[PDB]
């Protein structure tokens, strides 16, 4: 399924990478994307896959393009085109300065102060889930912890019932890792139809939850519309239900293979925040992009108005020009360079929430279950898309080596 090579794209810039099914997925998803950084591949290439689009392969280019919203607009930030065109989430499909006032509202509901507000529930839930698994001597990490821990905290934060998780999680995954089972537009509108009655209820009777706060905030000197509220809460749903979930899996899969890395963190827990950064770099997982607002020459390459460009947040930190021996996990790296939470004006608003969930996970897991591994003979499959992930992660351990606190 290769789209005909457009006339303005020279043949030597063609590299047919499929972001939804990279050829090297078996070696691990980050490894599969890292083929874009082998010496046979230019800094900036065109793939004919998924409609045809550019991909920046180097951190330097990815950062520049994320900064230059004048040429690289968030209007259409998803490949393929049909998805990016349907995509209307707020603030993510807006450029500055329009984006600005909506993002301040986002920061109000998922930013620092909400982390410190919710920190006790976060710690509480981590300990509770881990203690429940501890005596089993096994778990499916994706389903037993990676999903429920961040997702229940998000549902708590948004004041939504946990019974709604299965339905909302399915729709979220259709947008980031599409199955072909329903169009992006259909998935979005399914999520929108769920939010619509809730937002109306919470406009008429305001609560203190994230959804009440967004639905009742101010932009442009006036009340936010029911439509805008919907477009923002939609993004919060997606933001809350896929990235941390999948990132914890990558990290725990790594730690299952790395007894010496576990001991570093257990013996010197003050290194955990730096370790969090390193895992975020090494196991980075997001890849969206931008659309050209006009013809533009970028690093010697002629881009056309309306061209889509994938600017994989995943690749910046894997770039050997940014980090020596990028595939090696080194908690003492003097500088962990990455754009895992993105870059420029859209730099993730939930990044403080993400970090706290990661750091709490690292500490509390390794405290109670310091010695564990991947199930004997199990093959771990990764999946690739706008947000990449781990399909399943069966872990095992000897309960005699675990500890309650
Ligand atoms: C490891 C975990 C996470 C990663 C890797 C991640 C990644 C990213 C990236 C790369 C962007 C920028 C997308 C773009 O430039 O178009 C973004 C935006 C955003 N994310 Fe996250 N995220 C994580 C966790 C979370 C959490 C827990 C939330 C909770 C709500 C959240 C909510 C948001 C929101 C609201 C935006 C939009 C910001 C804006 O457009 O101004 N994220 N994320
Ligand atoms: C790319 C993202 C990670 C960012 C927040 C959720 C996500 C899937 C978006 O649509 C914007
Ligand atoms: C953000 N996800
Ligand atoms: K390259
Ligand atoms: K759009």
GROMACS .gro file of C-alpha atoms and ligand atoms in nm:
model
  463
    1UNK     CA    1   0.000   0.000   0.000
    2UNK     CA    2   0.234   0.273  -0.125
    3UNK     CA    3   0.083   0.604  -0.237
    4UNK     CA    4   0.220   0.736  -0.569
    5UNK     CA    5   0.536   0.944  -0.513
    6UNK     CA    6   0.441   1.313  -0.544
    7UNK     CA    7   0.629   1.511  -0.815
    8UNK     CA    8   0.816   1.745  -0.573
    9UNK     CA    9   0.975   1.461  -0.373
   10UNK     CA   10   1.310   1.334  -0.504
   11UNK     CA   11   1.355   0.953  -0.509
   12UNK     CA   12   1.664   0.951  -0.286
   13UNK     CA   13   1.452   1.085   0.003
   14UNK     CA   14   1.209   0.791  -0.018
   15UNK     CA   15   1.215   0.553   0.277
   16UNK     CA   16   0.901   0.342   0.308
   17UNK     CA   17   0.846   0.337   0.684
   18UNK     CA   18   0.508   0.224   0.820
   19UNK     CA   19   0.444   0.394   1.154
   20UNK     CA   20   0.155   0.157   1.227
   21UNK     CA   21   0.348  -0.164   1.148
   22UNK     CA   22   0.727  -0.107   1.122
   23UNK     CA   23   0.922  -0.396   0.971
   24UNK     CA   24   1.140  -0.453   1.278
   25UNK     CA   25   0.869  -0.462   1.544
   26UNK     CA   26   0.991  -0.805   1.661
   27UNK     CA   27   1.315  -0.651   1.793
   28UNK     CA   28   1.105  -0.409   2.001
   29UNK     CA   29   0.918  -0.096   1.893
   30UNK     CA   30   1.190   0.160   1.974
   31UNK     CA   31   1.436  -0.063   1.787
   32UNK     CA   32   1.197  -0.075   1.491
   33UNK     CA   33   1.178   0.305   1.471
   34UNK     CA   34   1.555   0.335   1.523
   35UNK     CA   35   1.610   0.190   1.172
   36UNK     CA   36   1.526   0.547   1.066
   37UNK     CA   37   1.854   0.648   1.227
   38UNK     CA   38   2.080   0.404   1.044
   39UNK     CA   39   2.342   0.550   0.811
   40UNK     CA   40   2.142   0.464   0.496
   41UNK     CA   41   1.863   0.706   0.590
   42UNK     CA   42   1.872   1.089   0.533
   43UNK     CA   43   1.782   1.337   0.810
   44UNK     CA   44   1.441   1.395   0.652
   45UNK     CA   45   1.263   1.133   0.443
   46UNK     CA   46   0.934   1.068   0.266
   47UNK     CA   47   0.745   0.744   0.321
   48UNK     CA   48   0.476   0.635   0.073
   49UNK     CA   49   0.301   0.441   0.351
   50UNK     CA   50  -0.024   0.563   0.507
   51UNK     CA   51  -0.109   0.818   0.236
   52UNK     CA   52   0.243   0.954   0.195
   53UNK     CA   53   0.422   1.186   0.439
   54UNK     CA   54   0.753   1.323   0.567
   55UNK     CA   55   0.938   1.194   0.873
   56UNK     CA   56   1.208   1.389   1.056
   57UNK     CA   57   1.453   1.138   1.196
   58UNK     CA   58   1.684   1.355   1.403
   59UNK     CA   59   1.623   1.532   1.734
   60UNK     CA   60   1.756   1.862   1.598
   61UNK     CA   61   1.499   1.872   1.316
   62UNK     CA   62   1.212   1.743   1.533
   63UNK     CA   63   1.267   2.020   1.792
   64UNK     CA   64   1.294   2.295   1.529
   65UNK     CA   65   0.971   2.187   1.360
   66UNK     CA   66   0.783   2.162   1.692
   67UNK     CA   67   0.894   2.517   1.767
   68UNK     CA   68   0.803   2.665   1.429
   69UNK     CA   69   0.424   2.648   1.445
   70UNK     CA   70   0.412   2.914   1.171
   71UNK     CA   71   0.514   2.651   0.914
   72UNK     CA   72   0.421   2.333   1.102
   73UNK     CA   73   0.059   2.363   1.216
   74UNK     CA   74  -0.119   2.146   1.470
   75UNK     CA   75  -0.437   2.173   1.258
   76UNK     CA   76  -0.378   1.826   1.119
   77UNK     CA   77  -0.149   1.652   1.366
   78UNK     CA   78  -0.224   1.285   1.286
   79UNK     CA   79  -0.128   1.053   1.004
   80UNK     CA   80  -0.313   0.937   0.802
   81UNK     CA   81  -0.475   1.250   0.657
   82UNK     CA   82  -0.836   1.142   0.724
   83UNK     CA   83  -0.756   1.108   1.094
   84UNK     CA   84  -0.569   1.440   1.117
   85UNK     CA   85  -0.851   1.618   0.938
   86UNK     CA   86  -1.114   1.476   1.175
   87UNK     CA   87  -0.893   1.554   1.475
   88UNK     CA   88  -1.030   1.858   1.657
   89UNK     CA   89  -0.928   1.802   2.021
   90UNK     CA   90  -0.840   2.113   2.221
   91UNK     CA   91  -0.569   2.248   2.274
   92UNK     CA   92  -0.385   1.999   2.052
   93UNK     CA   93  -0.535   2.092   1.711
   94UNK     CA   94  -0.479   2.465   1.773
   95UNK     CA   95  -0.166   2.671   1.704
   96UNK     CA   96  -0.046   2.962   1.920
   97UNK     CA   97  -0.169   3.203   2.023
   98UNK     CA   98  -0.523   3.057   2.002
   99UNK     CA   99  -0.401   2.747   2.192
  100UNK     CA  100  -0.277   2.952   2.487
  101UNK     CA  101  -0.595   3.021   2.687
  102UNK     CA  102  -0.725   2.665   2.654
  103UNK     CA  103  -0.395   2.526   2.773
  104UNK     CA  104  -0.407   2.736   3.091
  105UNK     CA  105  -0.737   2.561   3.165
  106UNK     CA  106  -0.576   2.222   3.095
  107UNK     CA  107  -0.292   2.311   3.333
  108UNK     CA  108  -0.557   2.392   3.597
  109UNK     CA  109  -0.696   2.040   3.581
  110UNK     CA  110  -0.398   1.807   3.518
  111UNK     CA  111  -0.096   2.021   3.608
  112UNK     CA  112   0.132   2.044   3.913
  113UNK     CA  113  -0.124   2.161   4.169
  114UNK     CA  114  -0.351   1.867   4.095
  115UNK     CA  115  -0.060   1.623   4.135
  116UNK     CA  116   0.012   1.758   4.482
  117UNK     CA  117  -0.362   1.760   4.548
  118UNK     CA  118  -0.394   1.392   4.443
  119UNK     CA  119  -0.052   1.264   4.554
  120UNK     CA  120  -0.188   1.067   4.851
  121UNK     CA  121  -0.448   0.883   4.637
  122UNK     CA  122  -0.177   0.810   4.383
  123UNK     CA  123   0.053   0.661   4.648
  124UNK     CA  124  -0.243   0.485   4.805
  125UNK     CA  125  -0.357   0.312   4.485
  126UNK     CA  126  -0.008   0.203   4.384
  127UNK     CA  127   0.053   0.034   4.721
  128UNK     CA  128  -0.295  -0.118   4.722
  129UNK     CA  129  -0.266  -0.272   4.372
  130UNK     CA  130   0.088  -0.398   4.430
  131UNK     CA  131   0.012  -0.555   4.768
  132UNK     CA  132  -0.286  -0.733   4.611
  133UNK     CA  133  -0.065  -0.887   4.339
  134UNK     CA  134   0.240  -0.955   4.560
  135UNK     CA  135   0.138  -1.295   4.705
  136UNK     CA  136   0.029  -1.434   4.365
  137UNK     CA  137   0.384  -1.478   4.232
  138UNK     CA  138   0.260  -1.373   3.887
  139UNK     CA  139   0.048  -1.113   3.701
  140UNK     CA  140  -0.037  -0.981   3.352
  141UNK     CA  141   0.120  -0.646   3.414
  142UNK     CA  142  -0.062  -0.465   3.132
  143UNK     CA  143  -0.400  -0.562   3.267
  144UNK     CA  144  -0.320  -0.597   3.639
  145UNK     CA  145  -0.133  -0.271   3.697
  146UNK     CA  146  -0.032  -0.072   3.390
  147UNK     CA  147  -0.397  -0.012   3.301
  148UNK     CA  148  -0.582   0.023   3.638
  149UNK     CA  149  -0.327   0.242   3.826
  150UNK     CA  150  -0.313   0.546   3.591
  151UNK     CA  151  -0.666   0.498   3.457
  152UNK     CA  152  -0.841   0.484   3.796
  153UNK     CA  153  -0.644   0.789   3.903
  154UNK     CA  154  -0.764   0.968   3.589
  155UNK     CA  155  -1.123   0.859   3.648
  156UNK     CA  156  -1.089   0.981   4.007
  157UNK     CA  157  -0.950   1.312   3.883
  158UNK     CA  158  -1.230   1.347   3.627
  159UNK     CA  159  -1.503   1.215   3.858
  160UNK     CA  160  -1.602   0.936   3.616
  161UNK     CA  161  -1.717   0.588   3.711
  162UNK     CA  162  -1.467   0.305   3.678
  163UNK     CA  163  -1.736   0.091   3.510
  164UNK     CA  164  -1.692   0.317   3.206
  165UNK     CA  165  -1.322   0.228   3.165
  166UNK     CA  166  -1.360  -0.065   2.917
  167UNK     CA  167  -1.565   0.140   2.670
  168UNK     CA  168  -1.350   0.455   2.696
  169UNK     CA  169  -1.025   0.258   2.674
  170UNK     CA  170  -1.140   0.078   2.358
  171UNK     CA  171  -1.222   0.409   2.188
  172UNK     CA  172  -0.894   0.564   2.300
  173UNK     CA  173  -0.697   0.275   2.151
  174UNK     CA  174  -0.888   0.300   1.821
  175UNK     CA  175  -0.750   0.652   1.778
  176UNK     CA  176  -0.385   0.582   1.868
  177UNK     CA  177  -0.349   0.227   1.743
  178UNK     CA  178  -0.634   0.191   1.489
  179UNK     CA  179  -0.773  -0.155   1.422
  180UNK     CA  180  -0.957  -0.060   1.104
  181UNK     CA  181  -1.268  -0.159   1.300
  182UNK     CA  182  -1.397   0.200   1.298
  183UNK     CA  183  -1.286   0.530   1.146
  184UNK     CA  184  -1.097   0.786   1.356
  185UNK     CA  185  -1.401   1.012   1.315
  186UNK     CA  186  -1.639   0.742   1.442
  187UNK     CA  187  -1.410   0.676   1.741
  188UNK     CA  188  -1.387   1.047   1.824
  189UNK     CA  189  -1.764   1.096   1.797
  190UNK     CA  190  -1.824   0.792   2.018
  191UNK     CA  191  -1.606   0.954   2.284
  192UNK     CA  192  -1.777   1.286   2.221
  193UNK     CA  193  -2.128   1.137   2.265
  194UNK     CA  194  -2.018   0.996   2.603
  195UNK     CA  195  -1.891   1.334   2.722
  196UNK     CA  196  -2.186   1.542   2.594
  197UNK     CA  197  -2.450   1.455   2.860
  198UNK     CA  198  -2.190   1.462   3.141
  199UNK     CA  199  -2.071   1.810   3.048
  200UNK     CA  200  -2.429   1.939   3.041
  201UNK     CA  201  -2.496   1.790   3.387
  202UNK     CA  202  -2.179   1.946   3.520
  203UNK     CA  203  -2.259   2.286   3.371
  204UNK     CA  204  -2.596   2.287   3.548
  205UNK     CA  205  -2.451   2.147   3.873
  206UNK     CA  206  -2.074   2.224   3.898
  207UNK     CA  207  -1.848   1.981   4.085
  208UNK     CA  208  -1.477   2.005   4.168
  209UNK     CA  209  -1.366   1.734   3.925
  210UNK     CA  210  -1.160   1.810   3.612
  211UNK     CA  211  -1.465   1.787   3.386
  212UNK     CA  212  -1.669   2.035   3.594
  213UNK     CA  213  -1.371   2.273   3.603
  214UNK     CA  214  -1.315   2.265   3.227
  215UNK     CA  215  -1.688   2.282   3.147
  216UNK     CA  216  -1.718   2.599   3.361
  217UNK     CA  217  -1.394   2.785   3.285
  218UNK     CA  218  -1.337   3.107   3.089
  219UNK     CA  219  -1.173   3.176   2.752
  220UNK     CA  220  -1.176   3.491   2.538
  221UNK     CA  221  -1.341   3.689   2.820
  222UNK     CA  222  -1.650   3.468   2.798
  223UNK     CA  223  -1.781   3.128   2.912
  224UNK     CA  224  -1.640   2.821   2.738
  225UNK     CA  225  -1.895   2.664   2.502
  226UNK     CA  226  -2.036   2.313   2.551
  227UNK     CA  227  -1.859   2.226   2.224
  228UNK     CA  228  -1.517   2.353   2.338
  229UNK     CA  229  -1.556   2.179   2.674
  230UNK     CA  230  -1.624   1.854   2.486
  231UNK     CA  231  -1.326   1.896   2.258
  232UNK     CA  232  -1.098   1.946   2.559
  233UNK     CA  233  -1.231   1.671   2.787
  234UNK     CA  234  -1.203   1.438   2.488
  235UNK     CA  235  -0.830   1.503   2.476
  236UNK     CA  236  -0.798   1.459   2.852
  237UNK     CA  237  -0.962   1.116   2.819
  238UNK     CA  238  -0.713   1.012   2.550
  239UNK     CA  239  -0.425   1.172   2.741
  240UNK     CA  240  -0.520   0.987   3.058
  241UNK     CA  241  -0.580   0.639   2.918
  242UNK     CA  242  -0.294   0.539   2.683
  243UNK     CA  243   0.053   0.694   2.738
  244UNK     CA  244   0.137   0.630   3.106
  245UNK     CA  245  -0.040   0.294   3.075
  246UNK     CA  246   0.191   0.183   2.794
  247UNK     CA  247   0.504   0.353   2.922
  248UNK     CA  248   0.488   0.169   3.256
  249UNK     CA  249   0.481  -0.158   3.061
  250UNK     CA  250   0.799  -0.076   2.864
  251UNK     CA  251   0.973   0.020   3.188
  252UNK     CA  252   0.862  -0.283   3.385
  253UNK     CA  253   0.959  -0.510   3.095
  254UNK     CA  254   1.305  -0.355   3.109
  255UNK     CA  255   1.331  -0.388   3.487
  256UNK     CA  256   1.224  -0.753   3.462
  257UNK     CA  257   1.550  -0.811   3.273
  258UNK     CA  258   1.775  -0.588   3.483
  259UNK     CA  259   1.846  -0.693   3.847
  260UNK     CA  260   2.133  -0.443   3.879
  261UNK     CA  261   1.909  -0.155   3.766
  262UNK     CA  262   1.651  -0.257   4.025
  263UNK     CA  263   1.913  -0.258   4.301
  264UNK     CA  264   2.040   0.092   4.214
  265UNK     CA  265   1.695   0.234   4.274
  266UNK     CA  266   1.622   0.028   4.585
  267UNK     CA  267   1.953   0.118   4.754
  268UNK     CA  268   1.957   0.486   4.646
  269UNK     CA  269   1.590   0.590   4.590
  270UNK     CA  270   1.702   0.952   4.542
  271UNK     CA  271   1.815   0.837   4.196
  272UNK     CA  272   1.460   0.737   4.102
  273UNK     CA  273   1.366   1.074   3.945
  274UNK     CA  274   1.678   1.066   3.720
  275UNK     CA  275   1.597   0.701   3.644
  276UNK     CA  276   1.244   0.808   3.548
  277UNK     CA  277   1.395   1.049   3.293
  278UNK     CA  278   1.624   0.784   3.147
  279UNK     CA  279   1.337   0.534   3.100
  280UNK     CA  280   1.128   0.807   2.943
  281UNK     CA  281   1.414   0.863   2.696
  282UNK     CA  282   1.495   0.499   2.621
  283UNK     CA  283   1.131   0.384   2.610
  284UNK     CA  284   0.978   0.695   2.455
  285UNK     CA  285   0.653   0.609   2.277
  286UNK     CA  286   0.467   0.900   2.108
  287UNK     CA  287   0.474   0.996   1.740
  288UNK     CA  288   0.247   1.261   1.600
  289UNK     CA  289   0.320   1.554   1.372
  290UNK     CA  290   0.219   1.867   1.188
  291UNK     CA  291   0.099   1.998   0.851
  292UNK     CA  292   0.279   2.249   0.626
  293UNK     CA  293   0.095   2.582   0.622
  294UNK     CA  294   0.274   2.671   0.297
  295UNK     CA  295   0.562   2.572   0.071
  296UNK     CA  296   0.879   2.581   0.274
  297UNK     CA  297   1.239   2.469   0.235
  298UNK     CA  298   1.353   2.293   0.552
  299UNK     CA  299   1.711   2.172   0.585
  300UNK     CA  300   1.760   2.162   0.210
  301UNK     CA  301   1.431   1.982   0.151
  302UNK     CA  302   1.142   2.136  -0.043
  303UNK     CA  303   0.817   2.083   0.150
  304UNK     CA  304   0.479   2.165  -0.011
  305UNK     CA  305   0.174   2.337   0.135
  306UNK     CA  306  -0.047   2.065   0.282
  307UNK     CA  307   0.228   1.806   0.317
  308UNK     CA  308   0.205   1.617   0.645
  309UNK     CA  309   0.518   1.566   0.849
  310UNK     CA  310   0.563   1.305   1.124
  311UNK     CA  311   0.783   1.446   1.398
  312UNK     CA  312   0.832   1.137   1.621
  313UNK     CA  313   0.882   1.250   1.981
  314UNK     CA  314   1.024   0.900   2.030
  315UNK     CA  315   1.327   0.962   1.805
  316UNK     CA  316   1.491   1.272   1.958
  317UNK     CA  317   1.623   1.083   2.264
  318UNK     CA  318   1.727   0.778   2.061
  319UNK     CA  319   1.928   1.000   1.825
  320UNK     CA  320   2.296   0.919   1.888
  321UNK     CA  321   2.376   1.286   1.818
  322UNK     CA  322   2.175   1.366   2.133
  323UNK     CA  323   2.273   1.066   2.348
  324UNK     CA  324   2.580   0.841   2.318
  325UNK     CA  325   2.496   0.469   2.312
  326UNK     CA  326   2.123   0.559   2.295
  327UNK     CA  327   1.989   0.201   2.332
  328UNK     CA  328   2.178   0.156   2.662
  329UNK     CA  329   1.992   0.241   2.985
  330UNK     CA  330   2.227   0.448   3.201
  331UNK     CA  331   2.076   0.605   3.513
  332UNK     CA  332   2.388   0.817   3.565
  333UNK     CA  333   2.384   0.982   3.220
  334UNK     CA  334   2.504   1.337   3.287
  335UNK     CA  335   2.235   1.465   3.048
  336UNK     CA  336   1.925   1.271   2.956
  337UNK     CA  337   1.822   1.449   2.636
  338UNK     CA  338   1.471   1.373   2.504
  339UNK     CA  339   1.139   1.513   2.382
  340UNK     CA  340   0.925   1.231   2.521
  341UNK     CA  341   0.656   1.470   2.647
  342UNK     CA  342   0.686   1.663   2.319
  343UNK     CA  343   0.823   2.008   2.243
  344UNK     CA  344   0.723   2.369   2.178
  345UNK     CA  345   0.382   2.508   2.276
  346UNK     CA  346   0.212   2.167   2.306
  347UNK     CA  347   0.464   2.015   2.549
  348UNK     CA  348   0.250   1.770   2.752
  349UNK     CA  349   0.027   1.929   3.017
  350UNK     CA  350   0.002   1.600   3.205
  351UNK     CA  351   0.378   1.554   3.236
  352UNK     CA  352   0.390   1.617   3.612
  353UNK     CA  353   0.112   1.367   3.666
  354UNK     CA  354   0.295   1.118   3.443
  355UNK     CA  355   0.626   1.157   3.629
  356UNK     CA  356   0.464   1.117   3.971
  357UNK     CA  357   0.287   0.799   3.860
  358UNK     CA  358   0.614   0.662   3.718
  359UNK     CA  359   0.826   0.745   4.023
  360UNK     CA  360   0.563   0.613   4.265
  361UNK     CA  361   0.547   0.296   4.058
  362UNK     CA  362   0.923   0.245   4.054
  363UNK     CA  363   0.962   0.288   4.428
  364UNK     CA  364   0.662   0.097   4.550
  365UNK     CA  365   0.697  -0.194   4.309
  366UNK     CA  366   1.068  -0.250   4.382
  367UNK     CA  367   1.011  -0.220   4.756
  368UNK     CA  368   0.760  -0.507   4.769
  369UNK     CA  369   0.868  -0.715   4.467
  370UNK     CA  370   1.243  -0.653   4.414
  371UNK     CA  371   1.296  -0.983   4.227
  372UNK     CA  372   1.076  -1.073   3.933
  373UNK     CA  373   1.108  -1.175   3.571
  374UNK     CA  374   0.921  -1.229   3.246
  375UNK     CA  375   0.723  -1.556   3.238
  376UNK     CA  376   0.933  -1.854   3.123
  377UNK     CA  377   0.925  -1.886   2.745
  378UNK     CA  378   0.699  -1.583   2.697
  379UNK     CA  379   0.739  -1.367   2.385
  380UNK     CA  380   0.668  -0.999   2.440
  381UNK     CA  381   0.506  -0.829   2.141
  382UNK     CA  382   0.516  -0.452   2.094
  383UNK     CA  383   0.268  -0.249   1.891
  384UNK     CA  384   0.327   0.073   1.703
  385UNK     CA  385   0.120   0.380   1.627
  386UNK     CA  386   0.063   0.737   1.739
  387UNK     CA  387   0.121   0.587   2.081
  388UNK     CA  388   0.323   0.265   2.083
  389UNK     CA  389   0.274  -0.004   2.344
  390UNK     CA  390   0.321  -0.349   2.489
  391UNK     CA  391   0.050  -0.603   2.402
  392UNK     CA  392   0.098  -0.818   2.717
  393UNK     CA  393   0.359  -0.863   2.988
  394UNK     CA  394   0.328  -1.181   3.199
  395UNK     CA  395   0.555  -1.149   3.502
  396UNK     CA  396   0.648  -1.413   3.759
  397UNK     CA  397   0.824  -1.410   4.097
  398UNK     CA  398   0.881  -1.611   4.412
  399UNK     CA  399   0.648  -1.474   4.685
  400UNK     CA  400   0.912  -1.577   4.943
  401UNK     CA  401   1.135  -1.298   4.808
  402UNK     CA  402   0.861  -1.034   4.835
  403UNK     CA  403   0.775  -0.807   5.129
  404UNK     CA  404   0.465  -0.626   5.258
  405UNK     CA  405   0.528  -0.282   5.410
  406LIG     C1  406   0.456   0.899   2.989
  406LIG     C2  407   0.337   0.959   2.980
  406LIG     C3  408   0.301   1.065   2.874
  406LIG     C4  409   0.362   1.095   2.757
  406LIG     C5  410   0.484   1.027   2.693
  406LIG     C6  411   0.291   1.205   2.693
  406LIG     C7  412   0.318   1.266   2.570
  406LIG     C8  413   0.264   1.380   2.513
  406LIG     C9  414   0.311   1.453   2.396
  406LIG    C10  415   0.434   1.414   2.313
  406LIG    C11  416   0.228   1.559   2.377
  406LIG    C12  417   0.239   1.666   2.266
  406LIG    C13  418   0.159   1.620   2.145
  406LIG    C14  419   0.172   1.723   2.035
  406LIG     O1  420   0.272   1.800   2.034
  406LIG     O2  421   0.084   1.728   1.946
  406LIG    C15  422   0.124   1.558   2.479
  406LIG    C16  423   0.018   1.647   2.497
  406LIG    C17  424  -0.081   1.648   2.595
  406LIG     N1  425  -0.098   1.555   2.697
  406LIG    FE1  426   0.051   1.400   2.747
  406LIG     N2  427   0.189   1.235   2.780
  406LIG    C18  428   0.190   1.156   2.892
  406LIG    C19  429   0.100   1.162   2.998
  406LIG    C20  430  -0.015   1.239   3.013
  406LIG    C21  431  -0.113   1.239   3.119
  406LIG    C22  432  -0.109   1.148   3.244
  406LIG    C23  433  -0.207   1.330   3.091
  406LIG    C24  434  -0.328   1.358   3.182
  406LIG    C25  435  -0.433   1.427   3.137
  406LIG    C26  436  -0.175   1.395   2.964
  406LIG    C27  437  -0.241   1.497   2.894
  406LIG    C28  438  -0.203   1.576   2.784
  406LIG    C29  439  -0.267   1.697   2.738
  406LIG    C30  440  -0.391   1.767   2.800
  406LIG    C31  441  -0.186   1.745   2.615
  406LIG    C32  442  -0.215   1.869   2.528
  406LIG    C33  443  -0.123   1.985   2.563
  406LIG    C34  444  -0.142   2.094   2.459
  406LIG     O3  445  -0.184   2.063   2.345
  406LIG     O4  446  -0.115   2.212   2.491
  406LIG     N3  447  -0.059   1.335   2.926
  406LIG     N4  448   0.153   1.448   2.556
  407LIG     C1  449  -0.033   1.257   2.085
  407LIG     C2  450  -0.096   1.253   2.220
  407LIG     C3  451  -0.009   1.168   2.308
  407LIG     C4  452  -0.123   1.392   2.270
  407LIG     C5  453  -0.213   1.368   2.388
  407LIG     C6  454  -0.292   1.246   2.351
  407LIG     C7  455  -0.241   1.215   2.213
  407LIG     C8  456  -0.278   1.081   2.161
  407LIG     C9  457  -0.294   1.330   2.135
  407LIG     O1  458  -0.393   1.325   2.051
  407LIG    C10  459  -0.212   1.451   2.167
  408LIG     C1  460  -0.066   1.259   2.653
  408LIG     N1  461  -0.095   1.156   2.632
  409LIG     K1  462   1.821   0.943   0.938
  410LIG     K1  463  -0.824   1.884   1.203
   0.00000   0.00000   0.00000
